Every structure is written in C-alpha cells, then in structure tokens.
Amino acid sequence: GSSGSSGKPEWMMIHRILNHSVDKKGHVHYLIKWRDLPYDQASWESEDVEIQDYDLFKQSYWNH
C-alpha cells in the first residue's frame, strides 16, 4: 500500500478537488476540501502534498 514514517494521518481525507490554481512560481495547487471540514474551511494544497489517493483525485478532476 503506502509506506513512510513522516507523511499524513488517516483521518485526513479528500472529499473532492474544488478547484486548481498555479502560483506565480509555477507549482500547481489543488483546492482540497477536507471531508471533515466544510467548504468554507477548505484549504489550498500544492500538487506535492502527499494524501490518500491524492494522485487519483487529481487525475480524475482533470479528465472530468
């Protein structure tokens, strides 16, 4: 599955990619909506952040 000591918890989930934005630097960011937290609490997470099935969500939102 997924290994690594320093990464991310289990409670942290990704409801659905609200939107995406590319900072002036270039790094692509994806507005992740922490299922637990509401939409008003949502936060911006770069495309580097390691989250459960993070690559899948990003791949999906894009295709669709």
XYZ file of C-alpha atoms in Angstrom:
64
model
C 0.000 0.000 0.000
C 1.785 3.088 1.303
C 4.894 3.222 3.491
C 6.683 6.052 5.271
C 7.013 7.276 8.850
C 6.599 11.014 8.273
C 3.657 11.595 5.953
C -0.035 12.090 6.683
C -2.672 10.772 9.125
C -5.661 8.567 8.302
C -8.485 10.895 9.338
C -7.298 13.314 6.654
C -9.493 12.657 3.617
C -10.102 14.412 0.299
C -13.817 14.963 -0.307
C -13.269 16.316 -3.820
C -10.999 18.716 -5.705
C -12.886 22.012 -5.520
C -10.565 23.727 -7.998
C -6.960 24.253 -9.094
C -4.580 27.214 -9.296
C -0.987 27.800 -10.395
C 1.030 30.158 -8.195
C 3.291 32.778 -9.775
C 6.127 30.323 -9.138
C 4.533 27.647 -11.302
C 3.752 24.938 -8.758
C 0.228 23.663 -9.417
C -2.076 23.742 -6.393
C -5.348 21.882 -5.837
C -8.068 23.289 -3.582
C -8.608 20.221 -1.402
C -11.799 20.028 0.658
C -11.147 18.113 3.879
C -14.249 15.920 4.070
C -14.255 16.516 7.828
C -14.048 20.285 7.359
C -16.713 22.271 5.461
C -16.276 24.110 2.161
C -15.670 27.436 3.904
C -12.814 25.827 5.835
C -11.282 24.204 2.756
C -7.608 24.979 2.151
C -5.186 25.140 -0.777
C -2.760 22.224 -1.061
C 0.071 22.182 -3.602
C 0.361 19.313 -6.083
C 3.222 17.986 -3.957
C 1.251 17.255 -0.786
C 1.017 13.517 -0.125
C -2.558 12.496 0.671
C -4.609 9.301 0.444
C -5.308 8.543 -3.217
C -4.238 12.128 -3.901
C -2.905 11.253 -7.354
C -6.237 9.646 -8.238
C -8.379 12.653 -7.320
C -6.108 14.995 -9.277
C -6.158 12.631 -12.258
C -9.953 12.418 -12.094
C -10.915 16.072 -11.664
C -8.704 16.751 -14.682
C -10.086 14.094 -17.028
C -13.600 15.108 -15.979
